[PDB]
């Protein structure tokens, strides 16, 4: 089993919980200490193309505008099994860096 | 016959554990006063027990020494006693059932235990059964 929880090591509020399926990637901005979610940007549960990586971006841009819209910026990335690689949000806007 | 030992005297308060119930056997020997019973005593009783009815039934000794009884050599003061020397003992709080017999007549059984009591440094009482259990 993977006890990953690479997260849990999230203390500076605002979590960009991702989630790669086997076709669609979902990202989600969440507030801890007070369990609730705000910004969201799925893969095909949205629409756009059929190419993972390619999509993985236009799917992140999504969070950008969407988020910035309601006054969001500085945050920390996320997703544990994640393995910072292919899946990506390498995009402007959010000051989550990376 | 084990563990790290030469322990603290400690004391015997109320006999909140002085009062079980015949577990096996048929008749029994329950204690009335609290005390430390030297193994020397147990045997000295048990023996006379069996010995009272040569080639008889079964004897059950629920009490069991494990507490080390220390003692000084006949001098003054300087660290705990040589300890043990004489040996170990078991702690009996008024009510505990020490010995219990079975497989024999009450005339034989009852009279058997009576003797034991003389060996023990306490005051005893003899019991039958039919009492406690967990049935319905």
């Amino acid at each position: 089993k993977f006890r990953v929880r690479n997260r849990i090591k999230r203390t500076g509020r605002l979590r960009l919980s991702v989630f790669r399926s086997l076709k669609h990637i979902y990202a989600q901005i969440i507030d801890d200490e007070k369990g609730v979610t705000l910004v969201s940007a799925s893969s095909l549960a949205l629409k756009l193309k059929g190419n993972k990586t390619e999509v993985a971006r236009q799917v992140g841009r999504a969070l950008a505008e969407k988020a910035l819209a309601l006054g969001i910026k500085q945050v920390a990335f996320d997703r544990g099994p994640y393995k910072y690689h292919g899946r990506v949000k390498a995009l402007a806007e959010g000051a989550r860096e990376g | 016959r084990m563990k790290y030992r030469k322990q603290q005297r400690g004391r015997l308060k109320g006999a909140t554990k002085g009062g079980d119930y015949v577990a096996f056997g048929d008749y029994g020997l329950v204690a009335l006063e609290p005390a430390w019973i030297t193994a020397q005593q147990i045997e000295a009783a048990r023996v006379a027990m069996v010995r009272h009815f040569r080639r008889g039934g079964k004897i059950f000794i629920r009490i069991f020494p494990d507490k080390p009884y220390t003692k000084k050599p006949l001098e003054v003061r300087m660290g705990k006693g040589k300890g043990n020397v004489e040996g170990y003992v078991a702690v009996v709080k008024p009510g505990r059932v020490m010995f219990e017999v079975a497989g024999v007549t009450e005339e034989q059984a009852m009279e058997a235990l009576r003797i034991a009591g003389h060996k023990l440094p306490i005051k005893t009482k003899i019991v039958r059964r039919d009492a406690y259990d967990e049935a319905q």
């Binding site: - | 006999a15 080639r55 079964k58």
Partner: protein, 176 residues
């Protein structure tokens, strides 16, 4: 058997105890009440009745409840009951211990050796309408050797043994 069970109001358990009563309690998934009887009473009944046979209490107001004693407490110094919980029976299949009887005389006399009632009475799941008085033990062909346990009993109908099965229920051993 039976015996008055006067409703316990709820005041000074000792007062009773000392006075003459004997605090108790009756209950099941439905009922739960404070009761009290009388030493001489309860004794005279239990001493022989115990908790193997059914007990029916006569509540001051008509009531006639079928019960059994699930547990009684003792005042260590000089065995004397302190409390009693009564199981108000009904119809649902219930658990309970039933007595056993060892008849005959298994080899063990030439040189001696006596048995050892390893489980006087056992619990077996059964429906109230049927509640065996005592069960039989056809053991008498075993010496200092082994012993019987579990499913070695002619457990009648509705007597699905409620144990392991494996509980050594008897054994014969050497003398002194």
């Amino acid at each position: 058997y039976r015996l008055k069970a006067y409703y316990r109001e709820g005041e000074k358990p000792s007062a009773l105890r000392r006075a003459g009563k004997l605090p108790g309690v009756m209950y099941n998934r439905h009922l739960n009440r404070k009761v009290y009887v009388d030493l001489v009473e309860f004794d005279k009944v239990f001493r022989q009745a115990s908790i193997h046979h059914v007990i029916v209490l006569e509540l001051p107001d008509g009531q006639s409840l079928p019960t059994l004693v699930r547990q009684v407490n003792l005042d260590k110094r000089r065995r004397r009951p302190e409390h009693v919980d009564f199981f108000v029976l009904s119809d649902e299949p219930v658990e309970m211990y039933v007595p056993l009887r060892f008849v005959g005389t298994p080899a063990g006399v030439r040189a001696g050796g006596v048995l050892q009632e390893i489980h006087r009475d056992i619990l077996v799941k059964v429906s109230p309408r049927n509640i065996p008085e005592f069960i039989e033990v056809d053991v008498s062909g075993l010496e200092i050797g082994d012993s019987l346990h579990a499913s070695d009993l002619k457990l009648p109908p509705g007597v699905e043994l409620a144990v392991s099965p494996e509980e050594t229920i008897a054994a014969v051993v050497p003398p002194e």
